[PDB]
Design a protein around this nucleic acid. Structure first.
Ligand SMILES: [Mg+2]
Ligand SMILES: [Mg+2]
Ligand SMILES: [Mg+2]
Ligand SMILES: [Mg+2]
Ligand SMILES: [Mg+2]
Ligand SMILES: [Mg+2]
Ligand SMILES: [Mg+2]
Ligand SMILES: [Mg+2]
Ligand SMILES: [Mg+2]
Ligand SMILES: [Mg+2]
Ligand SMILES: [Mg+2]
Ligand SMILES: [Mg+2]
Ligand SMILES: [Zn+2]
Lengths: 173, 107, 146, 242, 151, 129, 125
RNA sequence: GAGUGGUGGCCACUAUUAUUGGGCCUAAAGCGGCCGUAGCCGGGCCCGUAAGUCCCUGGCGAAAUCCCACGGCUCAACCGUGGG
RNA sequence: GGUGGGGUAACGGCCCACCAAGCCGAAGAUCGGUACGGGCCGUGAGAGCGGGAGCCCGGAGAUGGACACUGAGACACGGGUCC
């Protein structure tokens, strides 16, 4: 036989030039300030996997099925994608925008640590943001609900001083 | 006398050292049941068993048959057409590895 | 014609035999299993080949097109056969000289054969004296050893 | 093995009853021939280094063993390839600790802490019994050891019985018969590590193995091979079990 | 359809559903057996005896009376003849077909060019072989019995 | 020649219902056809039916109500296990609980819903929806 | 030399192409044709696993046993017949089942001289 | 997008190999016609058996590889503990 | 295939002497072509179709063809003999 080969974690479009798909993806890329299409595609694949697990478990029965069903629900609501009282059916109504709202870049922008999406990306990359006492430099990291509130400037960053010239400009908005 | 099969021994006796009932032969392993289809050679029979094999792609069955050569003790002396019971032993010839132990239904 | 047969539950062998029998009418399957392409392929299954130029020629386009297409005769190193190869580009024929060595590959037509209005030509030139021909056509590089 | 016996053992091919990381390195210790078999034992080096953690590297583990700090069934073992198996007793006298080797609920070997008094007795399953010259009876136990008895007591011992042996003197002090109502502990198969009482015994022709039915504490019934049932008491266990 | 000609004739008998013999029938079982034996001794075939009984004595099929000896089965002409030893040795239809084939063969000796009649002979012999196979299977004929025209 | 009385009955029923017939006669009767008719009546696909005795194998008389979309036999009679009913449903039925499959089991003839409730398998013989 | 591996012919009669060399553990040895002579002669063979076989080449005495269970050591006169081979009797070859004559009568050999190194026979009545 | 093009191979496209699921009046395709051996497919009822078939339960089908949750490398790829 | 032996660590037409005519085959023998087998890998909604170098388990080989010594284990890749 053949040994293991590591595989890509995203899927490319079936047809590269469809006008409607191009328009929709361009809107998303402009709004959330991503770097390249593949990054976007990565998140799409994640969504699909969730849906594909929900479809398989609806039509199943037995002992393992219940365990996997509750595990899926717990994992989904741990990420902050579902309310606490959601049921399995609610999995099928998730959209792509729901996942993009969980990126570290977006969350930094929404919390008011930056004025613009690109500025938030630069702040993350240069290492000025700490999450639960740890510095992370991947703007695409998905933030758990339990750790969302403990996101601040790094305690050794120049921005961790309210008299910094650039921080005052950020606060001005 | 018992040899672990829990069946009736043959009516009479023989002097063959290769008879599991009256000689030194030992039986151990698989036990099959079949129909004799040839008895030309001395102390040798050919037994055929039929079964069904399942073809996964076509979800249907086909008939297959298995032929085994077995030793024929004089105390039993099976003939063509009857149901026999055979058991596995040590090698006896180039192609003989079973021995007839009982005739279930004479032809 | 009646219902497709056999349909019986215990008719596996005949059904399998029928399907195996009529699969030989498929030309794609027959060529692959009998390995017919390998038996006549001058390149012997390679994607590219190296050869030596013997002479320059020109081929007329098929009707209703008009023009002369520039090609060369190439003798292959690996087995000594002779084939015809096309030279893509505007004025690319001027960069070829007799007794040069070239690299050729498939021309990319339907069913791995010829294309366009030049049937009978199956290969195109890619390198000349270990230099990309596309560069030489565009510039950016000069043909070695004059 | 084209021309002779094998001497090595890859990590990926190690027996599935060990607690070992299979991708950390290339090689694993090939155990020496000894008391138990491959599927029910583990080399001593992994006990010293990986389980208890008294040593970090193999080299310093061998220095510990060469000084005679470890006792298996009351005897000093210095070979780092020595196999340790089911029902054995591992004793460290300098730290004053004792363990019994037992299979887990999923079939892996674990160490069960035991009292000092219980550490002097080992249960042995009578695996076979034969006649030997001078007209004596030799008993062969499940861990490969042997014992001799006179012809007078030939009716007090049969296969599948359990003998409580005092170690390291190897002196018999109790015999537990295999019968209905006896307390058993399962050592292999799907129902490994379950314990209970015998209810029924069944036999089959032509040398197929025989089966037993066991009732557990909660009153559920399950079947298993007779040779997988280890007698441990009359109606209550004589040894501590997890 | 027909075995060889593939036509679709439908003519035949339409027996009404009834279990007990009709009231206006007055013969008993013993009278019927005596009549059957008498007619057989007159030299009639099994099919013809029933025809005579139906037409002249007003007796519908004898398969309306339980067999006095064996209560599990109804009475038929062949069983009645068997009870007295007058049953045919060869089944009647096979005998009729064989008799037809013998008569036709001596015609074809004088007329070797009558090819259309020869096909009829082939079909008759095919029917004969079918019947002999069926009868061998059920044990109505000895296993060595063979049909040879040269006999 | 005649090979399968059950298939003829179901084809006759589905042919007759398409032209609005109110009753049909199934010519060669059998116990299996009676069981299938009983199961079909239980779920409301047909009206009342009765057995009529002639000297031959007997006849069935069935009342139709115009509530059948399609009915057919399954050949060959595939064996099915107690947890494999879904793929056959997808193969023969239009929705996830639309219609019934009829299964012969060692406990009788029943719809696949009852068999799945009892946790047993059998052989598929027909479908109605 | 003498190879005892497998037949090169299938039971249906087809041929077999050998797929490997001959292993050492599959070889045989020369038969030992035990002759009748004035003095005995035997040798020792080192065998698989480092074991030994005692092979007898020339025989002069024999052990003859009675139905009572008593035996006597006597010398051998000649070989009367040998069912194993058609010409062993003429050449005086002793094998299991051969008939020999001694100073106290005829006897039938019950041992294998080539494997055991001794000759044991039962007395014929 | 640190990649992006060319040539050859396999799968899909393809219900152009069709068990699920294709065709044969006029488009490729019903032997010129018939008889029949093996094979395959075979009418209704009653009794028995339990080979096929269905359910329950013992012993097996190494590890790695695949899916899920939790845990360790900043997260991940990767690795460990459990359930399949 | 049978009877009687030899040889082997061991059963066996594995090899001999003697007695018979068996054994396989259109459900494909024999012969020819191609190829180390598997866990697995690629693709597809699935049914399927194609491959099986790299990691693990099993097999075989040491320029081609034959043959031996020592040894628990070899007819031995960094041991021996002939062509
Ligand atoms: Mg295409
Ligand atoms: Mg078409
Ligand atoms: Mg025609
Ligand atoms: Mg025509
Ligand atoms: Mg029927
Ligand atoms: Mg059964
Ligand atoms: Mg595995
Ligand atoms: Mg961490
Ligand atoms: Mg994680
Ligand atoms: Mg892992
Ligand atoms: Mg292969
Ligand atoms: Mg391979
Ligand atoms: Zn006997």
């Amino acid at each position: 036989g053949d040994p293991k080969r590591q595989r890509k974690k995203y899927e490319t479009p079936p047809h590269p030039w469809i006008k409607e798909r191009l328009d929709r993806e361009r809107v998303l890329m402009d709004k959330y300030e991503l770097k390249n299409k593949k990054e976007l595609w990565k998140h799409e694949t994640q969504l699909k996997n969730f849906r594909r697990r929900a479809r398989r478990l609806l039509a199943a029965r037995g002992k393992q099925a219940e365990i996997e069903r509750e595990q899926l629900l717990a994992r989904l609501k741990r990420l902050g994608l579902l309310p606490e009282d959601a049921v399995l059916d609610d999995v099928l109504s998730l959209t792509i925008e729901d996942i993009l709202e969980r990126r570290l870049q977006t969350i930094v922008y929404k919390k008011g640590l930056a004025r613009t999406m690109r500025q938030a990306r630069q702040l993350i990359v240069h290492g000025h943001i700490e999450v639960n006492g740890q510095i992370i430099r991947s703007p695409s990291y998905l933030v758990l609900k339990e750790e969302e509130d403990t996101i601040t400037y790094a305690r050794t960053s120049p921005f961790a001083n309210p008299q910094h010239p650039e921080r005052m400009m950020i606060e001005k908005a | 006398r018992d040899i672990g099969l829990r069946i009736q021994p043959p009516a009479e006796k023989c002097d063959d050292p290769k008879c599991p009932w009256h000689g030194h032969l030992k039986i151990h392993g698989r036990v099959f049941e079949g129909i004799v289809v040839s008895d030309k050679p001395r102390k040798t029979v050919t037994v055929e068993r039929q079964y069904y094999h399942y073809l996964k792609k076509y979800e249907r069955y086909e008939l297959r048959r298995s032929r085994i050569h077995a030793h024929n003790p004089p105390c039993i002396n099976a003939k063509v057409g009857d149901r026999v019971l055979i058991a596995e032993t040590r090698p006896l010839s180039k192609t003989k590895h079973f021995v007839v132990v009982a005739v279930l239904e004479r032809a | 014609p009646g219902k497709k047969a056999p349909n019986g539950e215990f008719a596996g062998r005949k059904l399998k035999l029928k399907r195996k029998k009529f699969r030989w009418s498929d030309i794609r399957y027959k060529r692959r299993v009998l390995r017919l392409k390998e038996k006549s392929d001058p390149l012997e299954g390679a994607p590219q080949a190296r050869g030596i130029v013997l002479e320059k020629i020109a081929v007329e386009a098929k009707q209703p097109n008009s023009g002369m297409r520039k090609a060369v005769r190439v003798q292959l190193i690996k087995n000594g056969k002779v084939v015809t190869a096309f030279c893509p580009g505007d004025g690319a024929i001027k960069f070829i000289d007799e007794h040069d060595e070239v690299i050729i590959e498939g021309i990319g037509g339907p069913k791995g054969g010829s294309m366009g209005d030049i049937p009978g030509i199956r290969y195109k030139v890619v390198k000349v004296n270990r230099v990309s021909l596309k560069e030489l056509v565009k510039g950016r590089k000069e043909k070695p050893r004059r | 093995a084209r021309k002779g016996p094998k001497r090595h053992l890859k990590r990926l091919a190690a027996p599935t009853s060990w607690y070992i990381e299979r991708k950390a390195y290339k090689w694993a210790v090939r155990p020496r021939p000894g008391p138990h078999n491959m599927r029910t034992s583990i080399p001593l080096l992994y006990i010293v280094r990986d389980y208890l953690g008294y040593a970090k590297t193999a080299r310093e583990a061998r220095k510990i063993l060469n000084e005679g700090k470890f006792l298996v069934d009351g005897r000093v073992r210095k070979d780092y390839k020595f196999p340790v198996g089911i029902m054995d007793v591992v004793s460290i006298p300098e730290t004053g600790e004792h363990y019994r080797v037992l299979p887990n609920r999923i079939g892996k070997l674990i160490l069960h802490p035991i009292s000092e008094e219980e550490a002097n007795i080992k249960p042995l399953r009578i695996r076979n019994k034969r006649m030997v010259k001078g007209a004596k009876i030799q008993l062969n136990f499940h861990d490969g050891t042997n014992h001799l008895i006179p012809l007078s007591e030939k009716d007090n011992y049969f296969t599948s019985y359990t003998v409580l042996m005092k170690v390291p003197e190897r002196e018999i002090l109790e015999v537990l018969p295999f019968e209905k109502g006896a307390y058993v502990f399962v050592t292999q198969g799907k129902n490994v590590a379950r314990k209970g009482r015998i209810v029924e015994i069944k036999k089959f022709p032509m040398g197929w193995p025989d089966v037993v039915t066991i009732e557990d504490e909660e009153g559920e019934l399950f079947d298993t091979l007779k040779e997988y049932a280890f007698v441990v008491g009359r109606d209550k266990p004589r040894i501590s079990l997890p | 359809a027909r075995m060889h000609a593939r036509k679709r004739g439908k003519s035949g008998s339409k027996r009404p559903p009834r279990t007990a013999p009709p009231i206006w029938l007055e013969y008993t079982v013993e009278d019927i057996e005596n009549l059957v034996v008498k007619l057989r001794k007159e030299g009639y075939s099994t099919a013809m005896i029933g025809t005579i009984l139906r037409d002249q004595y007003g007796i519908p099929t004898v398969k309306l009376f339980r067999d006095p000896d064996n209560p599990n089965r109804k009475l038929t002409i062949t069983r009645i003849l068997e009870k007295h030893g007058l049953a045919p040795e060869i089944p009647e239809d096979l005998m009729f077909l064989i008799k037809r084939a013998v008569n036709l063969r001596k015609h074809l000796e004088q007329h070797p060019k009558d090819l259309h009649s020869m096909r009829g002979l082939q079909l008759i012999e095919s029917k004969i072989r079918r019947l002999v196979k069926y009868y061998k299977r059920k044990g109505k004929l000895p296993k060595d019995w063979r049909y040879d025209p040269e006999q | 020649t005649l090979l399968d009385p059950l298939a003829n009955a179901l084809s006759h029923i589905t042919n007759s219902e398409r032209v609005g017939k109110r009753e049909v006669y199934i010519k060669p009767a059998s116990k299996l056809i009676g069981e299938v008719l009983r199961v079909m009546q239980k779920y409301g696909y047909i009206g009342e039916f009765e057995f009529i005795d002639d000297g031959r194998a007997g006849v069935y008389r069935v009342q139709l109500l115009g509530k059948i979309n399609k009915a057919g036999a399954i050949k060959p009679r595939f064996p099915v296990k107690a947890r494999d009913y879904e793929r056959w449903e997808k193969r023969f039925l239009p929705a996830f609980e639309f219609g019934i499959l009829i299964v012969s089991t060692s406990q009788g003839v029943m719809s696949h819903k009852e068999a799945r409730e009892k946790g047993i398998g059998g052989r598929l013989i027909a479908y109605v929806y | 030399a003498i190879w005892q591996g497998r037949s090169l012919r299938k039971p249906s009669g087809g041929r077999i192409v050998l797929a490997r060399k001959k292993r050492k553990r599959e070889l045989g040895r020369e038969p030992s044709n035990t002759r009748v002579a004035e003095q005995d002669k035997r040798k020792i063979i080192r065998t698989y696993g480092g074991n030994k076989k005692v092979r007898l080449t020339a025989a002069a005495y024999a052990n003859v046993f009675d139905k009572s269970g008593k035996g006597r050591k006597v010398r051998i006169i000649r070989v009367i017949e040998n069912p194993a081979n058609r010409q062993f009797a003429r050449r005086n070859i002793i094998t299991k089942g051969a008939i020999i004559e001694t100073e106290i009568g005829k006897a039938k050999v019950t041992s294998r001289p080539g494997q055991d190194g001794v000759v044991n026979a039962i007395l014929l009545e």
